[PDB]
Structure 1
């Protein structure tokens, strides 16, 4: 059901404080000055989110000007007041203008690296089930949120797969992604060639490129390194180290 899908959609998608607040105002007073944010709780109830004023208080004091948690109060179930201070590092107390445009850029629910997401459906007559396309750059976060089957999620970026799941899953991701890109343009390659390429990239425990930096960790011969790119620097380095080279 789609009601289950939108909860976990809103659990990973980047939701801003300025996107759920109906008005964000400064209030000047004869005894104090602060910034007042009233959470539009109707759009919280519609988006099916786990956020209220106490959650917004905890989302503040994470990389914002070093505001204190004592400076933020929870007077109602909507209003969240932020009493500013002196930053005292190339800043004047009129820094309310900084927080007046900066406080709607804090995140209260979701993953910080995810740009957007879209519920995707299938077309076949046998069923109707809902997969999830996450345009983001954090594989470990999407595998850890409640409601997402972490045993069956993949990625395009091989570095995230290497960092999260290991070198062998990065090898399988290289195979599947090269074969998918070759299939989508009408070409066809036997899987032994892309298998040999992926096993050449991952035989030192690290995903090495086919750049001049990955080839400088795979190959050892000075002439092979210096007949491709950066021809002079390998020569002076092999002169410095006294490096003997084989002709193998």
Structure 2
């Protein structure tokens, strides 16, 4: 049997496109090994079609309830507690659509000019990493004879920061105009211009030490790891928009832990994909096998209106059209009074309201309609 005949049979068969390519590749691989015949290929195709038809989900299945159960049940055996804090708190933060996740982590990739050697990766990381004056200083001492704060720095951290002394003094002088900066040796000397009160010294001493000399805001720690003969930069803190437009950084594969930043920078579909990836990674790390279809259903329900929504009273449940379903979950008095004010009408199209009333739910056998011809005799 030629490959053209196998391709024609695969195309003629009723199968999805992804199944067709895999089946054709497997048939090509097995054709040279065992010399498959035409009838064998036809029977294999028919069996594949039958298996695909068997795997189709029947209508009326409570897919949402099954997904919720299949996500919540493995969480009962999860473990609580660099600095990535996965587990049950991580999935709780993901499903609650937290604006600022605890310990954000940014995965930064490099282009062809920097992903091969460690020096280019190191300088890209030091460009991304935000270094301020308080971490560079060894100790803090307020001096009264000069009526201004004095800063000294160690040579090792100054050298590793990538900027020399002249860069530092030009950075503070340009940013701060209230006082001038003078430097000799390896010490910073600040001189005021119109400052006389001692209380005004403290408000200008703290503002100087927290000023970012270089890097992106929100990033304080950066590490570099090697995997798959490539260098990947992992940073503490998330600034996706700023790190995207940084030289030496590949923006196609760069991602962040913050799903809100993904939605704001990339899009809502990318936010849904990031939510799916985060849930899958958390489940894989915890050692729990969860089918991805539940995760995609949850993510689709989370991003139905074009924005990221939680699963609590302020998210999916909050925007439910049913008054009784909203009142039954978390907030009862407020939802009922708000519905009374607006004169809301509950169409009882959901499951919770029908359970409360005592009517059949629109799921499973509740959606089945029956007919029968009356003249029936044995």
Q: TM-score range by the shorter chain?
A: 0.7 to 0.9
Please name the residue that 1:218 is paired with: 319
Is 2:259–2:271's contact at 8 Å kept on the other side of the alignment? yes
Q: Judge conservation of contact 1:74–1:80 (CA < 8 Å) in 2.
A: yes
Deviations 1:23-50 (A, max 9, x none): 8774736xxx544546767754443237
Aligned residue for 1:48? 162
Does the aligned pair in 2 maintain the 1:115–1:136 contact within 8 Å? yes
Residue deviations 1:173-224, cap 9 Å, x none?
0111111112222222332221111111111011111111113443111011
Give the alignment partner of residue 199 of structure 1, picking from 288, 296, 300: 300
Instruction: Note if 1:11 corresponds to 2:115.
Output: no
Match of 2:244 in 1: 143
**Structure 1 pair 193–203 and aligned structure 2 pair: CA distance change class (3 A):** same
Between the aligned partners of 2:323 and 2:248, the Cα distance in structure 1 is: 53
How do 1:78-157 residues align onto structure 2 when only pairs under 5 Å count? 79=188, 81-83=190-192, 85-86=194-195, 92-100=197-205, 103-122=208-227, 127=229, 129-157=230-258
Which secondary structure state, in structure 1, belongs to the residue aligned with residue 277 of structure 2? helix
* Structure 2 residues not aligned, in runs of 5+: 1-116, 350-378
SS of match in other structure, 2:213: strand
Q: Contact between 1:182 and 1:189, CA under 8 Å: does it hold in 2? A: yes
Q: Measured at CA, do residues 246 and 16 of structure 1 come closer, stay the same or move farther in structure 2, by a change above 3 Å? A: same
Residue of structure 2 in register with 1:64 after alignment? none
Do 1:84 and 1:96's aligned partners in 2 also have CA atoms closer than 8 Å? no
Between structure 1 and structure 2, the one with the greater Rg is: 2
Question: Alpha-carbon deviation of 1:131?
Answer: 0.4
Residue 211 and residue 45 in structure 1: after superposition, are their counterparts in 2 closer, same or farther (change >3 A)?
A: same
What is the TM-score of this pair, normalised by structure 1? 0.78
Residue matched to 2:145: 28
Alignment check: 8 A CA contact 1:17 1:106 kept: yes
Higher normalized contact order (CA 8 Å, seq sep 6+, divided by chain length): 2
Give 1 or 2: higher helix fraction: 2
Q: Deviations over 1:73-107 (max 9, x none)?
A: 567797563415459xxxx4443245445533322
Partner residue of 1:185?
A: 286
Give me the whole-angstrom Cα distance separating, in 2, the residues matched to 1:82 and 1:95. 13
Q: 1:236 aligns with which of 315, 325, 337?
A: 337
CA distance in 2, matches of 1:142, 1:44: 23
